[PDB]
Design a protein around this ligand. Structure first.
Ligand SMILES: [Mg+2]
Length: 77
């Protein structure tokens, strides 16, 4: 959770809320349920955060939409 918290907190998202950490923990679990490693799942979240930074949509809603796409497509990495 350290890497995800660091990219979030150093890129103008503000503090990582307890809710959002819970949400990302659950996302890691959900990617694991379709065969991603913990590490690969973490990498996916980092990438979605990078995409949100570049689009200037630095919020969980935007990141969640990205991750839902990837999860249904079955993207492990
Ligand atoms: Mg927890």
């Amino acid at each position: 959770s350290n890497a995800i918290r660091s990219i979030w907190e150093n890129n103008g998202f503000g503090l990582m809320s307890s809710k959002t950490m819970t949400d990302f923990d659950y996302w890691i679990s959900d990617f694991e349920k379709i065969g991603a490693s913990q590490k690969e799942a973490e990498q996916l979240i980092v990438k979605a955060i990078e995409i949100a930074i570049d689009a200037n949509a630095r919020n969980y809603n935007y990141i969640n939409a990205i991750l839902k796409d990837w999860e249904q497509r079955g993207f492990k990495s």
